[PDB]
Design a protein around this ligand. Sequence first.
Ligand SMILES: COCCn1cc(C#Cc2cc(NC(C)=O)ccc2C)c2c(N)ncnc21
Ligand SMILES: COCCn1cc(C#Cc2cc(NC(C)=O)ccc2C)c2c(N)ncnc21
Lengths: 255, 262
Amino acid sequence: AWEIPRESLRLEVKLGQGCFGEVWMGTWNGTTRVAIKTLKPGTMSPEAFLQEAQVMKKLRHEKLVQLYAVVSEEPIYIVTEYMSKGSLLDFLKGEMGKYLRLPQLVDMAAQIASGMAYVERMNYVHRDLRAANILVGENLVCKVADPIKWTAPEAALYGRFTIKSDVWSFGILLTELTTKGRVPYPGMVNREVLDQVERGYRMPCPPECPESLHDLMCQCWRKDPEERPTFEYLQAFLEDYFTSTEPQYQPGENL
Amino acid sequence: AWEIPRESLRLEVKLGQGCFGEVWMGTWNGTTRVAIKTLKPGTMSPEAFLQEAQVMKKLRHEKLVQLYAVVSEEPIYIVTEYMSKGSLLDFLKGEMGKYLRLPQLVDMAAQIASGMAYVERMNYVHRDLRAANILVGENLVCKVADFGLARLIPIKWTAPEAALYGRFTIKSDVWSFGILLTELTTKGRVPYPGMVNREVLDQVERGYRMPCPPECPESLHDLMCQCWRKDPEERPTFEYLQAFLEDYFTSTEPQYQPGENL
Ligand SMILES: COCCn1cc(C#Cc2cc(NC(C)=O)ccc2C)c2c(N)ncnc21
Ligand SMILES: COCCn1cc(C#Cc2cc(NC(C)=O)ccc2C)c2c(N)ncnc21
């Protein structure tokens, strides 16, 4: 029922490139602006593209990128909604990044937490939550889409991926938001990162970030995955943030 | 207090020679290895030769060649830290260069951008940023050098507005950085190959810009082109350039794969 005919799609602008395929901006039925992901025949089993899209047929939330349609026979195409502003990572590092302040950035974290809260309700796991996999639309809409610096130790070392390891990544994602997309653990290589976080090292409070928000990060980074808060809790905390937690907030130079 | 007596200096090796003066390697007191810049009396005014040192006294940063001392009486001398590997230009085109690949060359660019970010914060302009004025030290340390022309706020490296109207700003220095990125990715080839100065000027005024060097990611050539935006105020800052280059292999080109030359 998701199937659509090939002549209904029009690929216009190439946005990205990979060994598994490409991503384009396009039109569906001449009217609907859309994102279109393609599969490169031979580079991957169709079964793998089909698994992703089967999952996207089961999940539906305003903060998860919506699948609109598919072309299941090779060459495959996956059609979704169009997030005009691209990746959160690019957004934060680029010309728009410089005007974002703490209230905008905490609202972006609340949207992402709301989408992850939904994933949590549905008993799914993301495994790769980070700024590069968050998509930004008009009016600062952020939606979840699709790496040891973002990966909880129990996952990286022992392969124990859970919603709690996603919560760890969310904490790291909070640092990207408050540094304008700077790589976490700056000047540390992966192996140094691994050894340090095992020994208890945790990133410090970013400059101009209230300590209350860095406290939340550290909750997300509790060694014991079951001590980490839920996305339901994180969503509520960030939604209420400027009344319940930092009611005396004052804007500064960067946050 | 920057003044020192000559007897504390010991000039040993002639490293370079020029019309304004020379560059020598030496010893300061009896323990400190130093570089010593010389003036040939008459070839240039002492006040002008001293201007460089005047600027170097106010600037201090790990990615800028450090002034140690001066000899103001004729013949003047400028004493600075010694950079064991010489100029980035010579390095790039010489035998050590040929194994430099993109991760090393972007790290060099990141270091140079960190020093220029400092120049930017201090509201200085360099005016002569290019591979021949970056010095290489141990562990591939790169430091910005030669601030003769620098001051408080070569047309192949000079932004059009500076070359034409004398509008030298940190943004014209940013244009030069873009040119320097091409020197980094071609192993120090002269930019605009096969163009004389006048045609370079004519072309860049008409909107011509060097293309993406062989094996250079387009993302990095996009950065060069940002640096070369006609409107100097549309050129990025060194703060942005530094952050971008430091994070490059995770945030920008995470699928980088080594090739034959980059
Ligand atoms: C201004 O640059 C735009 C960059 N950019 C990249 C996008 C993407 C994507 C995508 C993700 C999936 N799969 C899952 C599980 O997420 C499937 C198909 C696609 C096309 C994308 C988009 N979607 N919308 C707007 N901009 C997008
Ligand atoms: C194997 O070839 C070595 C060549 N070579 C040339 C050098 C120089 C210089 C210099 C630069 C400044 N200007 C500023 C703003 O710093 C002032 C005075 C001097 C002498 C130099 C150096 N310094 N160290 C190591 N090698 C150097």
